[PDB]
Amino acid sequence: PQITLWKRPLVTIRIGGQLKEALLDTGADDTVIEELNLPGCWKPKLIGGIAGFIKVRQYDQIPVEIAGHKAIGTVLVGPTPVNIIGRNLLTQIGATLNFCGGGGPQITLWKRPLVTIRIGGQLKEALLDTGADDTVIEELNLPGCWKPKLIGGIXGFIKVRQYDQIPVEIAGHKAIGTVLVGPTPVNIIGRNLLTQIGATLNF
Numbered sequence: 001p002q003i004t005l006w007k008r009p010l011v012t013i014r015i016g017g018q019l020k021e022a023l024l025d026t027g028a029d030d031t032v033i034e035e036l037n038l039p040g041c042w043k044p045k046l047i048g049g050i051a052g053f054i055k056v057r058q059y060d061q062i063p064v065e066i067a068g069h070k071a072i073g074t075v076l077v078g079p080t081p082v083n084i085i086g087r088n089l090l091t092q093i094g095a096t097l098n099f100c101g102g103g104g105p106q107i108t109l110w111k112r113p114l115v116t117i118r119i120g121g122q123l124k125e126a127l128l129d130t131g132a133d134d135t136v137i138e139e140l141n142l143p144g145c146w147k148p149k150l151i152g153g154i155x156g157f158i159k160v161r162q163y164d165q166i167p168v169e170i171a172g173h174k175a176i177g178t179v180l181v182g183p184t185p186v187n188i189i190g191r192n193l194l195t196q197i198g199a200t201l202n203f
């Protein structure tokens with residue numbers, strides 16, 4: 001399908017013979033599902049996100065059907081806030097990010113989808129993250145008025161400053177919207193701005 005980003009790109013998956021809902025997440029390296037039993041041997045791993053690290057169980061070579069497309073690969077199981085399908089399995093199902101219906105650049109997911117953005121007169125690198133509702137930029141002395149906000153992910157919550165109506169050029173495409181500024185480990189372009197540049201998921 002072609003999936004636009006006005007809503008969270010939630011899809012049904014089948015894993016271990018059971019149905020679950022999960023988020024297609026281009027900002028995730030790996031696939032992480034809520035605590036469940038999986039037929040297999042596993043090993044302990046730690047993974048990180050916007051607010052810190054959690055402990056997970058790594059299962060390798062697990063069959064997963066993702067909106068009807070087959071994958072067999074690594075599934076991490078643990079206390080994730082949201083079930084997420086990450087790049088390890090998105091690449092298996094042929095998923096790419098596309099600008100303006102496929103008239104624009106296609107970005108494959110073999111490596112993290114990092115692009116150049118311009119904000120506040122400054123050029124920065126940021127991750128195109130379909131699993132992010134909002135856009136979160138590293139500490140930056142943005143002018144203007146703002147309101148406090150807390151945003152959550154793996155690890156919990158960080159406190160950020162919410163700025164509205166900030167222009168943000170992404171790979172040469174003009175956008176303008178809400179930008180959250182705080183101690184993120186990676187600059188993240190989320191759905192609020194991805195939609196403005198006509199970004200879709202396709203597989």
Ligand SMILES: CCCC[C@@H](CN[C@@H](CCCC)C(=O)N[C@@H](CCC(N)=O)C(=O)N[C@@H](CCCNC(N)=[NH2+])C(N)=O)NC(=O)[C@@H](NC(=O)[C@@H](NC(C)=O)[C@@H](C)O)[C@@H](C)CC
Pocket residue numbers: 025027028029030031032046047048049050080081082084086127129131132133134135136151152153154184185186188190
């Ligand atoms: C779990 C909640 C949904 C998925 C998540 C994916 N974001 C990426 C951002 C990149 C890191 C800051 C992420 O955590 N990716 C992880 C997923 C875990 C994984 N293993 O794949 C990742 O790739 N982690 C790498 C490490 C990332 C950084 N590495 C590095 N800088 N070298 C990993 N291998 O551990 N989305 C979010 O974290 C966003 N949260 C949300 O969109 C919503 N919040 C919640 C709680 O649902 C909304 C209601 O606020 C944040 C940005 C705020 C808008």
